[PDB]
Amino acid sequence: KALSAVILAAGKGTRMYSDLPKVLHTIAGKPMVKHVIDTAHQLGSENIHLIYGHGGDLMRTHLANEQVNWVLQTEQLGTAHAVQQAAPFFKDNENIVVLYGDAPLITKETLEKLIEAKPENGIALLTVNLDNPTGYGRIIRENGNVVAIVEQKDANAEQLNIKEVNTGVMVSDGASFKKWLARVGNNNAQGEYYLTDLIALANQDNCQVVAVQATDVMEVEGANNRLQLAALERYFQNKQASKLLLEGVMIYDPARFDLRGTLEHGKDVEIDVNVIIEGNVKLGDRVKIGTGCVLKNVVIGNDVEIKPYSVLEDSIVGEKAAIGPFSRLRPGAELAAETHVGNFVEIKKSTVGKGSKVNHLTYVGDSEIGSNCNIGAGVITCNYDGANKFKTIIGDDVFVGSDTQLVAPVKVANGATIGAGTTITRDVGENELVITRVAQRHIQGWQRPI
Amino acid sequence: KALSAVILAAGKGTRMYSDLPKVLHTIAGKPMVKHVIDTAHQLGSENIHLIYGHGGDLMRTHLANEQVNWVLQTEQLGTAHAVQQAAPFFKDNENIVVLYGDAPLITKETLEKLIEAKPENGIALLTVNLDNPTGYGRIIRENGNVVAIVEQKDANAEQLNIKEVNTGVMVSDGASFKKWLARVGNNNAQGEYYLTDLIALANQDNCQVVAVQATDVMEVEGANNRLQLAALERYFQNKQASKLLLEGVMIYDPARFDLRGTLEHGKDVEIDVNVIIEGNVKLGDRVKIGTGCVLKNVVIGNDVEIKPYSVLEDSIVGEKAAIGPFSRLRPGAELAAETHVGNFVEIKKSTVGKGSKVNHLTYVGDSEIGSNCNIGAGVITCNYDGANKFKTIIGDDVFVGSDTQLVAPVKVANGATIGAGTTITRDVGENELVITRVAQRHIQGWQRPI
Amino acid sequence: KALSAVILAAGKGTRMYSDLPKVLHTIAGKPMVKHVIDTAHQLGSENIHLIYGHGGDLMRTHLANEQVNWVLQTEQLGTAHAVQQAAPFFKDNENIVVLYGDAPLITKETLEKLIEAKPENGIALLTVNLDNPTGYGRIIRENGNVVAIVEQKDANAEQLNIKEVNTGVMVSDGASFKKWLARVGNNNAQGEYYLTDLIALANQDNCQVVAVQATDVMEVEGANNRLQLAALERYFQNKQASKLLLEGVMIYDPARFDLRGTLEHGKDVEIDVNVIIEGNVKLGDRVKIGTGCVLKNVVIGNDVEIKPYSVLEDSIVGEKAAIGPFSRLRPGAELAAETHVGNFVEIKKSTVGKGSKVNHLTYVGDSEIGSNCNIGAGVITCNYDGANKFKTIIGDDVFVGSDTQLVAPVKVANGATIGAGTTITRDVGENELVITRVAQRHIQGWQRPI
Ligand SMILES: COc1cc2c(Nc3ccc(NC(=O)c4ccccc4)cc3)ncnc2cc1OCC(=O)O
Ligand SMILES: COc1cc2c(Nc3ccc(NC(=O)c4ccccc4)cc3)ncnc2cc1OCC(=O)O
Ligand SMILES: COc1cc2c(Nc3ccc(NC(=O)c4ccccc4)cc3)ncnc2cc1OCC(=O)O
Ligand SMILES: [Mg+2]
Ligand SMILES: [Mg+2]
Numbered sequence A, B, C: 001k002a003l004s005a006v007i008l009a010a011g012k013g014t015r016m017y018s019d020l021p022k023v024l025h026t027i028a029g030k031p032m033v034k035h036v037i038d039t040a041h042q043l044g045s046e047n048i049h050l051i052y053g054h055g056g057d058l059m060r061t062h063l064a065n066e067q068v069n070w071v072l073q074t075e076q077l078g079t080a081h082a083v084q085q086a087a088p089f090f091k092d093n094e095n096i097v098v099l100y101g102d103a104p105l106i107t108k109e110t111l112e113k114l115i116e117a118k119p120e121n122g123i124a125l126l127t128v129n130l131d132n133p134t135g136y137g138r139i140i141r142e143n144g145n146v147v148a149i150v151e152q153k154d155a156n157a158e159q160l161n162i163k164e165v166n167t168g169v170m171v172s173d174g175a176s177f178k179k180w181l182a183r184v185g186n187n188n189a190q191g192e193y194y195l196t197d198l199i200a201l202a203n204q205d206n207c208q209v210v211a212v213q214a215t216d217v218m219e220v221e222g223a224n225n226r227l228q229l230a231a232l233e234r235y236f237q238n239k240q241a242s243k244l245l246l247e248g249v250m251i252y253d254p255a256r257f258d259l260r261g262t263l264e265h266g267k268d269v270e271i272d273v274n275v276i277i278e279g280n281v282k283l284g285d286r287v288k289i290g291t292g293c294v295l296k297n298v299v300i301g302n303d304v305e306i307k308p309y310s311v312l313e314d315s316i317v318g319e320k321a322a323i324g325p326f327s328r329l330r331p332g333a334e335l336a337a338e339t340h341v342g343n344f345v346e347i348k349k350s351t352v353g354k355g356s357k358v359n360h361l362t363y364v365g366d367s368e369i370g371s372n373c374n375i376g377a378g379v380i381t382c383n384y385d386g387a388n389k390f391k392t393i394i395g396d397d398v399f400v401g402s403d404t405q406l407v408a409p410v411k412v413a414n415g416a417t418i419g420a421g422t423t424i425t426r427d428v429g430e431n432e433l434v435i436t437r438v439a440q441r442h443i444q445g446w447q448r449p450i
Helices: A032-042 A056-062 A079-084 A108-117 A174-181 A195-204 A226-247 B032-042 B056-062 B079-084 B108-117 B174-181 B195-204 B226-247 C032-042 C056-062 C079-084 C108-117 C174-181 C195-204 C226-247
Strands: A003-008 A048-052 A069-072 A095-100 A123-129 A138-141 A146-150 A164-173 A209-213 A257-265 A275-283 A294-300 A311-317 A327-329 A340-348 A357-365 A367-369 A380-383 A392-394 A405-408 A410-412 A433-436 A440-443 B003-008 B048-052 B069-072 B095-100 B123-129 B138-141 B146-150 B164-173 B209-213 B257-265 B275-283 B294-300 B311-317 B327-329 B340-348 B357-365 B367-369 B380-383 B392-394 B405-408 B410-412 B433-436 B440-443 C003-008 C048-052 C069-072 C095-100 C123-129 C138-141 C146-150 C164-173 C209-213 C257-265 C275-283 C294-300 C311-317 C327-329 C340-348 C357-365 C367-369 C380-383 C392-394 C405-408 C410-412 C433-436 C440-443
Touching (some): A003 A079, A032 A048, A032 A095, A032 A108, A095 A174, A108 A209, A146 A195, A146 A209, A164 A174, A164 A195, A174 A195, A226 B226, A340 B340, A340 C340, A357 C340, A392 A405, A405 A410, B003 B032, B003 B079, B032 B048, B032 B095, B108 B123, B108 B164, B123 B195, B146 B195, B146 B209, B164 B174, B195 B209, B226 B257, B226 C226, B357 B367, B357 C357, C003 C032, C032 C048, C032 C095, C032 C108, C079 C174, C079 C195, C108 C123, C108 C164, C164 C174, C164 C195, C195 C209, C357 C367, C392 C405
Parallel strands (some): A048 A069, A123 A209, A257 A275, A275 A294, A311 A327, A340 A357, A357 A380, A367 A392, A380 A405, A392 A410, B003 B048, B123 B209, B257 B275, B327 B340, B340 B357, B380 B405, B392 B410, C123 C209, C257 C275, C294 C311, C327 C340, C340 C357, C380 C405, C392 C410
Antiparallel strands (some): A095 A164, A123 A164, A138 A146, A433 B440, A440 C433, B095 B164, B138 B146, B138 B164, B433 C440, C095 C164, C123 C164, C138 C146, C138 C164
16 A cells, blocks of 8 residues: 655754754765655655754755655654654555654665565564664564563563664554554653554554564664764665675775765776765776776766776766876866876866877866867966856867967867967967967076076 | 873884884874873873883984983883882872883873772772783782782683783882882893782782773783784774764764874864874864865864865965865965865965965965965966075966966066966066967968878 | 696686676786686696686686696586596696685695695695584594585584585695596586595595695685675785784785785885885885875885875886875886975876976976986976977986976987976077077056956
8 A cells, every 4th residue: 555754854963063953964975864765765655754843944955855745843742743743644544654864774675574564553663683782672572563662771681681672663554643643641751752652552452563673783773973974874885885896896995985876887897995986977888997086977988997086077988088097077078989188187168079188287178179189288278367268169180289378269170280388369270280489598608506 | 199100112112123113103193102101291290201222312303302201221121120210210209100102092081090099008000801811910809909910821720711911000109119119029931020020019018909990902002013003003093083073073984084183173074085184283164175185284264175185284274265176285375265276286385365266287386376366277486597486476356377487586466467378577567467479380281190 | 746736717707797707807906816826836836727618718818928727628517527627637646736716815825734734645625614604515524534525405413513614625646636536426416526526535445535724714715706806805905914014014004005916115114094006016215105105016215205196107216206296107207316206297208317306287208307407397398290209308407497398309408497488499508598588568557357
């Protein structure tokens, strides 16, 4: 039957010592709560009820495009009170899964298993085994069905040795939630309405509560501070790296690899140590990425080698291209097949045609460069003062001599040759050779001050 | 009552295979012995007696400004002999704590606890529990008071299972040290005067020896070689990173973070992987540091972003500035608020005014640049041959065209405009436009050799 | 007596998801099979029989210069069948050691111990203790001599608790191999001729099989996929780093150090985090390597400092030189003693004489530079269009002004001085001062568009 989700995301996260609310801190480049929202969507959730409160304006701005129901909680009275804020929107005939915005690593696979196990009119409770369960609510089974969650302070000597504990994640139908949430009381040391009390209330109605164990404890771990957040980050990155390794990506050291988005890859892709992949990246067959590279939102064709300490963003690189080391591709850089970009070169919002080379100490911005061009060392595209970033157009088979300035707007036609040290302000015609006439003074017998 | 410290630092450190003496090898950028000296000072030590020997001249040069008593030991006859070298300087009425220059991670907190526990006319002995205590002197308690330290070769089957062992760190009063040190003998397999024998001598005088356990074993671990030193380094860096994380600094991977000095920070500071912080660094609120950056002795204002692979030293950066990627700030670089420094740019001993930009392939040295200037790509400040690094002075609202050389000493006044490819040797006046008149030869129908 | 080796290397390595065969994937920059071949050679193997099959053409091209006997297996019928392919080449009177091309970390020391233990006309079997031996063939000893290898599915409750298991590595004489290999059958669930059956056949002949335990399990671990390969890589790099640390090399973080070849070092060498050493590298005394450096096939003299993010290949650096940060040395770079190479500088196939400095934003290619030269910022060596990379020759004590282009072929004699912004096309004589005569237009009262 249908499914909807409730995500608790109202927490201040005081121990983060941040102006952000708790769930907006990122794992792998995206907010903890976004991980959970995405997981909820992957499960096929019809509605996603987001319980929010602290940092409300920041939540709204940071998650503006998320397809969620914004349930603004005015006061924090416990998890049961939080869930009950969304209860009026529950369908009687749908399943509801309760999730936590500060526990981001819960997987679709584990939640599918939880939902599957839910008995009619009953509850499916996600549990986990801990080597040291001290502090956590112990799962008491009579059958394989949960009759109680006994808290640390109430447990007898025998119960304290129970390793299986409550995670707080649970599934039940909407009608049952609406029914039981209205019966939850707050007579306890904290004065809070606990969602945990639904296990008791379910048993009061002779409805069975089934336990389902999480595969990894890190799926249910929350982040209360940045040390814990860093632990989740490393676990997540290791898991991502392991998946890629088993898919056939050669990651030289998975402990020194970071994926912050999505990676599409071909076969025989090699990634050296300390590479960061951000946004949506596509790598073709036999792509080799050297140490220290940063790729953000890029498409890299087959057989490309990116040499060390290259930074690429919002760019496209054709097959058999060679980039780096120390290359910078800024947004809008489009390199054709078999191109060459070398050290201390910056390309911004420019197209570079097949076979062309830009190998040293050069800035190319707002330009179109044709096929088989030779852009010499020290070449710079620039503008007049007060300009609006006008374009430099370079044709096919053009030689641009070293340390030449190309002053936009300007066009250099096919087959043109430009001598070293030239300032190009007027258009250059097809097969036109332009060389600078220098005036020099030569003084003989100049003894250096040494 | 008063406190003084004795630090054993005479060792050759043969297994380091170094020309340095043992205690001068660094942890987090400073000598092992300096860590211990600093800890001794933090405790409120009145005197610090440094027992030294091997590499004496190097010790003297490397630790010249340390407020210690230089006790030169001419021969190594054991720990008791070493401590007795400083004994004539002990006050009868002060406490003396014995520390080791090759065991650098001992904390102030642990030592305060040790001193607190010292009974009058007795000894406080720092101990530690080891899972495998094989090789170490076993602590024999009768009460919670130490009656013997039984060495591995002397221990019976029962005593070998004792996990608590001697660390060698101890506190006693000066009069008691002077008394007992004179009674220590050398009748043992090594022929050495052992400080350990004070436990026996104390009990001979019916003076109680109290045991105090160290929190972490790494506090009492020594470094005999560079493998062990590296282990201490990693433990120390992890501990530093954890502290910063709990304080609210977002360190993306604490295993790839290095602090070699002191870090002052605001809130919501983000530090990406493989960053090194050296000397005294201050970061404001919401500072973001990209991957691969090196910051040494820098002050960074609020809301600054440092992009990847930037190296900064002895520099100041104003609020909302943008630095990198691939930026180099050398000593004396002072960037005002809202400045921009880009890839392949080097700034040395220069001031750059509010809003100014230096974004590509540029060297600015020994210069003053005003507010809202545009320093084009390829611009270089230089000197005449035989000069003494003279200054380039650039006013407010100046445009410097790409690939221009500024030849110091030279002044460019407010509002001036300099065309691309210019060589500036004479002063430029207010609102003066200077453009280079180029001579070019144009040859039509030049067929390239392709 | 004499020794020869058989290496099994025929596997497809399907779970690598690669166009390469299994054993060509690299550990520390070289094919897994090459590690084993080298180890076989270090042991003093007279012949090395390489059993190959899948990716045969790639094996042949990648391992063309290896001194091995190429035994092409046409079908995979089990390990015994594989070894029997080389059996006709076994000497009756030599020992034969069987090794696996996908288990690269087996050490010479372990194999020497295995060979030593081999009883006459018997077998030496390499075994290993596993905490969880589930799945592996259990070693059954009667004496300290192996009477059976009992597989998981056949073992009784008692035998399953045996921790010692078969690795598959074994030594026996050539005559015995030829004898027993002909008796191996394939009556089992897999229908394969197993080398394991030699233990049974040896006991049938009343020949003793002796067990020898491997020191580390990682010596006998195979890599079936890239996740397992990465685990072997990290173990190997840690082991290499540990060796260097114990030899006296200061590696700041051995978890962030990579050696992919061989390193020769002096004393007091310091290597910061994220350094990669490739090919054959030699470092002198007191060499300091900053973070992020890549050194491939380089010789570095005494007292050289390489600052962060420098990339060096096929280059030589004289004593007391200073390189970096952000320096690029390409093949053929030869720097003399006391030279200086700075940020955003690229040197290719050039010699640079004693005391000379090239400190900013410069390309020097195909050049000879003499002693005590000053190569200014922005200097570029270049060629005419259609040239064949001709040479620039610069003498001793030459000053080259900033942003000057040197157009090869050209010679600049001793003591010459070149002004900033010059284009040098004609040879410059001894003590000749060359300065560019600029034409400038100065327009007063030019109000900028701001
Ligand atoms: C941050 O948003 C909230 C998270 C909560 C939250 N998060 C959470 C829940 C469970 C875990 N996981 C475990 O308890 C657990 C961890 C390891 C093993 C077993 C269990 C972690 C975080 N728990 C309880 N209340 C929460 C309330 C939150 O805001 C809503 C509000 O303030 O009304
Ligand atoms: C390097 O300076 C010295 C250190 C010593 C030294 N250092 C030391 C002492 C204790 C530890 N720690 C432990 O024994 C220990 C470690 C782990 C668990 C328990 C104990 C480590 C280094 N120990 C003994 N004698 C030492 C002598 C030294 O030079 C003075 C001289 O040569 O006279
Ligand atoms: C890749 O080349 C082969 C490796 C084999 C191979 N490699 C191997 C052998 C042993 C181990 N190690 C273990 O079994 C082991 C690991 C850990 C503990 C104990 C044992 C790993 C790889 N094993 C068996 N057959 C193999 C066959 C191969 O190609 C030859 C052919 O296909 O005919
Ligand atoms: Mg230039
Ligand atoms: Mg120029």
